[model samples]
Target chain A: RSVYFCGSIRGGREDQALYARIVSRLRRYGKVLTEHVADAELEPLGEEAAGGDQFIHEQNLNWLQQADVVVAEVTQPSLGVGYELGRAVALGKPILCLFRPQSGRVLSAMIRGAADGSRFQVWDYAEGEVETMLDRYFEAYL
Target chain B: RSVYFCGSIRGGREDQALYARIVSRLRRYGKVLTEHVADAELEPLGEEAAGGDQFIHEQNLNWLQQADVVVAEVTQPSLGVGYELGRAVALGKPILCLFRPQSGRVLSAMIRGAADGSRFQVWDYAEGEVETMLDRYFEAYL
Candidate 1:
């Protein structure tokens, strides 16, 4: 099974190191399909190059469609993450959303209140919660 | 007291109208300070081009610092909204977040299990729930 990891690219790089760490850990469970690390040319493209931007978005949508599940680190704000969530919902793919509670204010209301009853799970953790939740979620679901 | 409302500038124009409607109704309660509809001449300039991005962001931080409470719409993807939420939380401002469940999926775990018990409230609203929740929260808190 493939897992798509979503995080901010153009929004800000403040969280890129964390995204890299999460993506590394995600590889143990399944293949991590992230354009930032997967594509060799992506890094040199300056993260927001118009062509690279379109490609990553399209590639992300494709990955979301093909993947068995999606795990998103929504600690920071990113349009790409929102798009991935919307697409994962449309594709009927299960999503595991991981966020850091102490990073900012609690998760926004928009995220907590999903009327769809889709196969989406939210985990709020502090330091080690991400790995623990990921293990539990995959152990039960996968 | 002044209330600042934030929504998507590009992702959800339809929902932006909902924000406008809510802000209009909120005007009956107190001063509603919305950047989108604030200055007639300023509205035309896009966030990045008008330098309105920084202006609005700084203005929101200022308002959040002074306001007794803060409310946010998290339906669509918005960086500015997230920034506003972060600032509000930093300022120890009380916040209520409203989201349309049908439009998105469950938020990440970080939000679902926040440590701050009453700092944030997430409500999943249908068509009329937005206004109802707004009324309820405001009546209870304001």
Candidate 2:
């Protein structure tokens, strides 16, 4: 029942509010291991954070390994988020990707394709459509 | 003898020209396996190039496995590129990531840190600086 919620961090923090909204809903679902994903200081995995690669890598992977599911707000392209999802996919965990494409912005094929395949689900939504959409996806899967 | 070039496919092709530039330079070092990264039609890993996810997944992984090195143009955030990097990282393949900080865009920590780590190299470039930086990195590694 634990959900590992991921959204843009270093890739882009403009969507922090959007990630907060999704994290709020995800908290109701279960333990959201990555709630700090919404923290402002976490940018570029902030140098303030466990300085050095080993600390960061080990900590996050540990979370992904323990989580029951991975929910990613993928509308904003994030190398960190993508890498996290990559780890989750390799672990064979169920993944749910949410994308609200913005004009002039492109989503990567690897993410879209993975969602399109049996591995995970990608929900493309519009304004105000995210709340219920997320609810149903969690209900069906979790 | 081969390079697996990664870039934003679906994440937004805003930097196709830059990618093309990098790919062109990479060609001097060796054959860029994902040379199609520069092509417009290759956006989002379109179906015209591959039939489905399984095919694409197996196909790209195959290339990464065979490549002598991995070169990623990460100025633009990309889930696909991240995933590709993840695969390469797991394989312990040499990686070179390129990022250009622009107003309003943020680089992901996982990517940046990986580049900063002993595992790989990251180059932050500005106009007219990429060519030599890439050439030097490839020359040293390849």
Candidate 3:
């Protein structure tokens, strides 16, 4: 299965460690297209090194279009991730959004409300439960 | 024609004045369904007064689905705006994204790269160039 996993990049990188863990867990399922999301060494400007703005955007969109299933960590607010999920929902891909609530931060209503269960879901989980949640989501959807 | 105009709410409100300006210009073209985007009195918490999270999401999606055209100001990064644009692009609505370049901020690649110019466009504008851009977009699409 081709999985496109997305988390915050330019929006914020506070969760890159968590993103890496999620990506590692997702690798047990299938190919993870955006594994660099977890790169602790990655800088925001690293996007320039990887590819310029337009190049990366086009490439990610292409990967997203071809993916079988989509998984996103939505705890951090990322315009990029939100944009990708928007496209994923439109493409009718099975999507699982994992949100870890933190103090003083709330999940976006657009993401939460877009979930109707079955196909699209917003799973709320705390630390150490991400892999377990993914195990269930993949079993049910993938 | 029903138009859905969106801008940053919780993401940032530095451009609320510009959003209101865009909304006023959009009214000249058709019914702008989300005029509250420009409400200067609005607070981030004002979403609570506007019927809370899920209700607002549901209502916006309905309005967006019904809109003949979607116009958004992309000057500020908003998860909500990105989410709406994602759905608008999927629904194949005629979309016009207005971007005002700032010193430190850059427009999201997902948005700029998504434009193919016929159905979707990301127009870069300066302060006074806004209405003129809208005038052209509406005359061409609507």
Best by DockQ: 3
Task: Between candidates 2 and 3, name the one with more favorable TM-score.
Answer: 3
Candidate 2 local accuracy as lDDT?
0.78
Q: Write the per-residue lDDT of candidate 3 for residues B36-139, one digit (tens) a residue.
A: 98999876733464466668888998999989999988877667788899888889898889887753556677787788877888899988989999998888
Model 1: docking quality category: incorrect
Q: Residues B1-142, candidate 1, lDDT per residue (tens digit)? A: 7776766553335565677667766776677766453222333213244433335445545666667767767666553455455445546677777767686444322222221447777666886767777888778874
Q: Which ten contiguous residues of candidate 3 chain B have the minimum total lDDT?
A: B43-52
Pairs with steric clashes in candidate 2 = A106-B10, A106-B11, A106-B12, A107-B10, A107-B11, A108-B10, A108-B11
Model 3 over residues A48-75: C-alpha lDDT tens digits?
A: 5445566777899899998999999887
Please give the range of 10 consecutive residues that has the lowest summed lDDT in model 3 chain A: A45-54
Between the candidate structures 2 and 3, which one is better when assessed by lDDT? 3
What DockQ, between 0 and 1, does each candidate earn? 0.06, 0.43, 0.50
For all the models shown, what interface RMSD does each have?
Answer: 14.9, 3.2, 2.2
True contacts kept of each: 0.07, 0.50, 0.47
List of clashing residue pairs for candidate 1 = A111-B107, A122-B109, A123-B109, A123-B110, A124-B109, A124-B110
lDDT values, one for every candidate: 0.59, 0.78, 0.83
DockQ ranking, high to low: 3, 2, 1
TM-score of the B chain in model 2? Answer: 0.89
RMSD of each: 15.6, 3.4, 2.6
Off by over 4 Å in 1: A35-52, A115-118, B1-142
Error of 1 at A14 (Å): 2.1
Cα lDDT, model 2, residue B115 = 61
lDDT of 2 at A42: 56
